[PDB]
C-alpha cells in the first residue's frame, strides 16, 4: 500500500494569508524523506497549482467562494485518482476548506469511508451560520448529507455532492464551537469527543470508543483530517486559530498511533500549519516538527521504537 | 436561578498587595458581560467598600486581624442576603481569607452546604500553626467546627460561627501543605485529592468520587471556593503563591463543567488573582482569562459548545 | 535505613561535556540539606575522583572505553560498600553510563534486585548496535545477562559481570529508541511502558503494573535509575538528549512517591543533569529543581504534605 503526498498550498479559505506556505514548511523539514524511512512506499505528487478565479465576488457573506470551490474541485480530482490506484493520499494543508476536495475525492473511491476529525473546531458552519464568510470553518457543512439543501448553492461548489453522513464522522479535540455549530452537531446526532470527554475518559478510552462507533458494525476506510490546532497552542502555535486547553503532543501521537494500528487509514489531511504565524522562529519549527511527527506516526512510527524485519540487529 | 457578582477587593489577608485589584481585572476582561451570554440572569452588586480598621495591631502572630475580620463580616452579610433572595453568589477575590465571610454568609441560608476547595493549599492553618500571621492561609480554620476552640479568639472574628464540618469539605489540587496543616487534615479525616490522587485517578474519577462523597447520602447546595493557584503557574502565574505541578487548564475546566452539571452550585469564589504579580503583561491576561473561563464554565459554558433553545439555527 | 549520596561527576560516557557538573549543580541547590529534613539519616560520601585513563583509544566505534570502564568499576566498589553497610545509595550523575557501576555495585549486595529505568531512552545499544560509540547509551547492554557474549569484550569492562536478567528491568518513559534497541527489547521480552503505554493506562495503572510485574512473585530491593530526560524538556531542558512528549513533572513525582511507598527503594540514580545545556539560566534551575524534587520524593516527601511524628502541631 503506497503513500502519495499531495501539497495543497491554499489559504483563500480564510482572511489571513500564510497557510499556503504550510506544504513548503513541512517539506523543508524533510517530511517526505522521513516518510520514506517507514515501511511505506512514498511518492510525492508535488504541490497543486491553484488558478485564482478572477473577480471572485463574495457570495452573500461567504468569501472567495469560486476560488475555494475551484481549488477543492481540483484537489478532489487528484485525490480520487491516487485513491483509485490504491494508494493512501496525504494532503498537506493550507487551510481546512481543502478537506472538501480531499474528502470528496476520497469518497468517490471509498464511499463507505468514515471520518475522524481532529480539531479544536467542528468547521461545520454553513454559509448561513458563519459570522465570517470564511470557508475554512465550513468544510463539514459542504460534506454532510444531512445538511444538503440547508443553505443556498454557493458558486464554485456545484460539483460537490454530500458524501458522508452525520453517523460517519467523529470529532476529537473540540473546544471552540459556535452556537449554530453546536446546534448543528446536537441536532444531527454527530459523535464527538470534545476536550471535556477526553479529560473524562482519557485519550485511550476515546480512541477505543471512536473505533467502536465507526468500525464496530463494519470495517471501512478511515479518513483522518487533522487540524494542527486540535493540539494545544503550546505544541502547535503556528496556526490561525489557536485555542487553549488542547490535546497534548502525546495525545496527538496516541491518536495517530492507534489509527495506524487499525490498518485502515486511507486518507490523511495535515492542515492549518501557518509558518507566518509564529511569535518566534522556533514556534514555527515546533509546529512544523509536531505536524511531521503526527504524519510519521500515522504511517508506523511508534514511540516505543521501530526496527526493520529480517534484520538480526545483533 | 439568578447570579449575583460581588467584588471583594481585599488583600489584607496577606503581606503583599495587589490582589485587591483582582475584581477590577476580572471585570475589565468582560466577566460580567460574558456571564450575561449564559442561560443565567446576572446582577452585579459591585465591589464592597472595606473600612480599614485603624491601629489594627497584630494579634500574636496574626496580621491585620480586625481588618480581615471586619471585611469578612461585611461580606458575610452581603452574601447571606443574595443567598436569601435565592440567587447564586459569585465572589471575586482579593485574597482567600474572604472565603470566611463568603462561606459563612452562604451557610446562614444553606447550613447543609458542602465545600469543594480547589487550591494548591489547604488554607487550614490556625492562628497557632501559621508560620506567617497571614489570614490567607487560615480560612478553613475559622470555618471548621472541629477546630472550634483550638485557637484563641482572634479580634474581629467573634461573629464567625464554625459552619462546616470536616466531613463537608473536599480539597482538590493540594501540593503545598504545611506540617501542621497536614497534621490537621489527617487528624480531622478531611477528604482530599492532592495532585498525587489526581495523577492516580484522573480528574474524571476524582470529580466522580468527590460528588459521591459529598452528595451520595444527600443532595445539598455546593459552595465552590476556587483559588486560582490551584492550577499550575503555567496557566495562572499571576498569584501570590504559585506552586509547580498544578492542575491543568483542562482539569480546571473539567472540575467546573462537572460542578455545573450537578445543578447544585450555590456559591462561588474566584480568588487570588493578583494583576500586579505577572512577570509580563500577558501572564496577567493569561491568569485573568482562565479565571474568567472557569467562572463561565461554572455557569454552563461547555467546551463542546453551547446553543440557545427554541432556536432553529438552520 | 540511612542514605548515602555519592557524586559521579563523569561525562566521558558522551561526546559533549558538562554533565560532570551535574553533582555540583544538585548540591548547590541544597539537595543534601533538604534530604536531611526527611525521615532519613543522610551521609554525603562526596564526589568520586575519576582517574582519566591516558591514551584511551576508541574500541572500534566505542569512545573512551577504558575511562568509562574505570570510573564505573570504582563507582561499583563504592556503591557495593555502602550497600553492604545497609544504606540506600544515591548516585548523582554525570552521564547514565555510570549506571553500569551503580547497578553492578548494588547487585553485589542484592543480586535479587529489580531495576526501574525512567528514561526517554532504553540505553541498551551494544558496542555493535550503537551509531555513536557513546557508552551513555549502552548501560543496560553491559548489565543484561541475556546480552552476555553478544558483543566483543570492551577494554575496561572485563570486571563487569551481567547482573540483571531481562525479566528484572522495567522501562518507563520510552519515546526515542533506535531500531537495534527496539529489536533488542522485543527479542528479549523486556517489560516497558513507553509514552504510549503511559498515555493509554495513566501513570497510576503503570506503576501499579510495574510493581505487580517486578514484585508480584517476590518482594526484592528496588533500584531506580532515573534519567532526567525521561521527563519532558519543558521540565528538564538541561540534558544532552531532550525528546518532546515526555513524562510530566507530576508523573515524575508520582513514580517516585509510589516507589517510596513500597519501602523497597535500595538504590537511586539521578542522571543526565547538564548545567551547561540550558538555553537560559532558569532552564538549568528548572532542571535542577525538578531533579531535587524527584530525589526528595523518593525519600518521603509527599505532595499532600508531611509532618513529624510525636509532634502535636496544635
Ligand atoms: Mn481548527
Ligand atoms: Mn479545522
Ligand atoms: Mn492557594
Ligand atoms: Mn487559597
Ligand atoms: Mn535518556
Ligand atoms: Mn539514559
XYZ file of N, CA, C and O and ligand atoms in Angstrom, chain C residues 96 117 119 123 227 272, ligand 6:
25
model
N 24.582 8.656 32.201
C 23.994 7.365 32.509
C 24.864 6.122 32.353
O 24.451 5.028 32.742
N 13.828 1.676 35.220
C 14.555 2.641 34.401
C 13.655 3.727 33.785
O 12.913 3.474 32.824
N 13.427 6.815 31.624
C 14.264 7.433 30.614
C 13.452 7.574 29.316
O 12.426 6.920 29.117
N 18.814 2.991 26.422
C 20.247 2.925 26.695
C 20.739 1.491 26.618
O 21.637 1.103 27.364
N 16.755 8.848 34.557
C 17.392 9.737 33.599
C 16.489 10.952 33.562
O 15.307 10.861 33.240
N 22.026 12.542 34.063
C 21.897 13.416 32.913
C 21.628 14.899 33.096
O 21.329 15.583 32.101
Mn 19.764 7.487 29.967
